[PDB]
Design a protein around this ligand. Sequence first.
Ligand SMILES: [Cl-]
Ligand SMILES: [Zn+2]
Lengths: 30, 30, 30, 21, 21, 21
Amino acid sequence: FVNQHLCGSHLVEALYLVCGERGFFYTPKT
Amino acid sequence: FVNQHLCGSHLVEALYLVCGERGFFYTPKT
Amino acid sequence: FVNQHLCGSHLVEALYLVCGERGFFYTPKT
Amino acid sequence: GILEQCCTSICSLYQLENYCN
Amino acid sequence: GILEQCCTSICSLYQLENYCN
Amino acid sequence: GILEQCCTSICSLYQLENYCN
Ligand SMILES: [Cl-]
Ligand SMILES: [Zn+2]
């Protein structure tokens, strides 16, 4: 299954919400 | 994994769609 | 769990993005 | 609740309807 | 179908492209 | 990274905050 890929979609949407105008970097690094 | 948390996101989006102007209460209660 | 149902939601959103004005058919057929 | 009922297996529009006001 | 192919493992943009009209 | 930390278990708003610029 693609658990990680689906989860990541929700993560950036949460970052978009929490980080606001400040923005954020998304680097899927182990 | 966060199956439940991810699923719940889709649930409220479905409730938003099905319930319309009536609205809905979301209470994650076992 | 509803892995497939949740995944499919993200799939059509991806098709919407990749296919653009051309559109697409979504037929969950095994 | 709705999490146990609808994340375990799929809820139909009719089942979701019962969660609406 | 697309569910078996793209929910089991990730589909690339190129693979998704083949589902477009 | 954020995938291992927040997809394994839930990250709080406070944890997410630390990923913001
Ligand atoms: Cl999901
Ligand atoms: Zn999702």
